[PDB]
Amino acid sequence: SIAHLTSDDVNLPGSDFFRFYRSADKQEKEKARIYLLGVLDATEGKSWCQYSQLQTVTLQEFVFEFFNKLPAARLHERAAPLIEEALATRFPCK
Amino acid sequence: MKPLYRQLKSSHYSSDYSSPGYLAAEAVYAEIGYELDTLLKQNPGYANTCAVRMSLALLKTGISFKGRLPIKKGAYKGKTIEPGAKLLADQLHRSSSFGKAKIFFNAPDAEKGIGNKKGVVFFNKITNYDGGHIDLIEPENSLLTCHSHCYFNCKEVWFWELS
């Protein structure tokens, strides 16, 4: 596993992301939420829609719930596509 | 009459996954007799639950308000939920036992005005989102923290102080 989240942690596994995402350290949790922000901005209006209709806390809640219900086997997948899947499947562009 | 802050907080389900008061949207809607997935198909906006959560907290503290969403199950069957933050805020402001909110037109004013106090906050017209956010706010260290989320990136901050 990765100890703490840095900008060098490319190909970030779902398990590592999810650990930082839930961190009791507010700065660590914020860093994980910023990784999420990058993924959101990269995919919004393309695979899922959309900022005008969905608050950041809403996006954050649904991402958490997806990760929380994920079979342990899937946590080895990269964090970004998992996040994308979470939102694409619930909030498609129409 | 106006509820204490702690009582209202105790009846409020946070939508912040990291909060000790957290409850997920599916469980929140289930309590009042709705299926989250059904609602999302009607309108994705139902995913934004701050006003649903605030409505429920108000009901649980004996506070009266008009809502558009009829409650189908549980202790408050026959009562209503207001799922829109602005609509709920407009009602608390125009016509409730909370009285009129203090209105701030920028974040610095809001932060100084709220100061060390606690109560109900409404963030009106959030940047990049078509709507607002209603929540509970209180000091933590020397910063303000909301039960679910703060949105000072907005046009106006309304505040009703609670004891």
Author numbering:
A (entry chain A): 30 to 123
B (entry chain B): 1 to 163
Quote what the paper states about this structure:
Some Gram-negative bacteria target their competitors by exploiting the type VI secretion system to extrude toxic effector proteins. To prevent self-harm, these bacteria also produce highly specific immunity proteins that neutralize these antagonistic effectors. The opportunistic pathogen Serratia marcescens has recently been shown to utilize T6-dependent secretion of two family 4 amidases, Ssp1 and Ssp2, to mediate antibacterial activity.
Following purification using a co-expression strategy, we determined the structure of the Ssp1–Rap1a complex at about 2.0 Å resolution. The structure of the Ssp1–Rap1a complex revealed a tightly bound heteromeric assembly with two effector molecules flanking a Rap1a dimer. The overall dimensions of this heteromeric assembly are about 90 × 50 × 50 Å and its molecular weight is approximately 60 kDa, consistent with that observed by size-exclusion chromatography during purification of the complex. Rap1a interacts with Ssp1 using residues in α1, α3, α4, α5 and the α4–α5 loop. Arg119, Arg66, Lys59, Glu94 and Glu94 of Rap1a form salt-bridge interactions with Asp37, Asp16, Glu140, Arg53 and Arg53 of Ssp1, respectively. In the α1–α2 loop of Ssp1, Tyr17 is relocated by about 7 Å to interact with Tyr50 and Arg62 of Rap1a. Rap1a, which has a completely different fold to the conventional Tai4 proteins, does not possess a protruding loop, but in the complex a helix is positioned to block the effector active site and the interactions that stabilize the complex involve residues in the C-terminal subdomain of the effector rather than the N-terminal subdomain.
